[PDB]
Design a protein around this ligand. Structure first.
Ligand SMILES: O=c1[nH]c(-c2ccc3n[nH]cc3c2)nc2ccccc12
Ligand SMILES: [Zn+2]
Lengths: 47, 161
């Protein structure tokens, strides 16, 4: 893995074209996330 | 060390996690190529992931980050999709779970949009789709996402397409 930018713990990817997109985030240390919920699902075919 | 506890659909915790999953679906610029064509999910199960060692690893790091950032962990709840979700829940996140070729460098990527993480369930770009039918838009096969607690601390803001 890379390092975070100096003086930062993560990167925020702010969407700047698609006005409907929400943010995406990057961490560089595995210890900075805990997998709290496991969700089992199907995608649904639109009507 | 990991145990999985089923949540009941009647539990407020199941309901609030389902709502986050459903309400953060969006359309994607690939027309559904990677993740499939859908507006919503059929949630089959939600389980709490309980691992004392992994939790302590997380909270230890959270305190370090917090003390470097005026007592602010900047903790978020975010989605993660990966072919390795079964390894993550048993061993935690590490360098093997990084997106080496990601837009923001080799790190572990998380999304606010559940449908963004859904694009990675079968690999980068949806890989070859589901194991059974090789269909990235499979409506039959069962998928898994993680809804994760993530410490951002001081986050570097990247404006981007
Ligand atoms: O949930 C995500 N997983 C992944 C992901 C997960 C595991 C991977 N292994 N190799 C590449 C990966 C990408 N990338 C994302 C990028 C942006 C937003 C969310 C995600
Ligand atoms: Zn399938």
């Amino acid at each position: 893995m890379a390092h975070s930018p100096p003086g930062h713990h993560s990167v925020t990817g702010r969407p700047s074209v698609n006005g409907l997109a929400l943010a995406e985030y990057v961490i560089y240390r595995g210890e900075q996330a805990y997998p709290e919920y496991l969700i089992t699902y199907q995608i649904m075919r639109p009507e | 060390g990991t145990i999985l506890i089923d949540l009941s659909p009647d539990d407020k915790e199941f309901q609030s996690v389902e709502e986050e999953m459903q309400s953060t679906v969006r359309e994607h610029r690939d027309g559904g190529h990677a993740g499939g064509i859908f507006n919503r999910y059929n949630i089959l199960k939600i389980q709490k992931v309980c691992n004392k060692k992994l939790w302590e690893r997380y909270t230890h790091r959270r305190k370090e980050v917090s003390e470097e950032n005026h007592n602010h962990a900047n903790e978020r709840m975010l989605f993660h999709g990966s072919p390795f979700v079964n390894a993550i829940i048993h061993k935690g996140f590490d360098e093997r779970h990084a997106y080496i070729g990601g837009m923001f460098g080799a790190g572990i990527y998380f999304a606010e949009n559940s449908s963004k993480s859904n694009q990675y369930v079968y690999g980068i770009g949806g890989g070859t789709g589901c194991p059974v039918h090789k269909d990235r838009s499979c409506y039959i096969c069962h998928r898994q996402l993680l809804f994760c607690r993530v410490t951002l601390g001081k986050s570097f803001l990247q404006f981007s397409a």
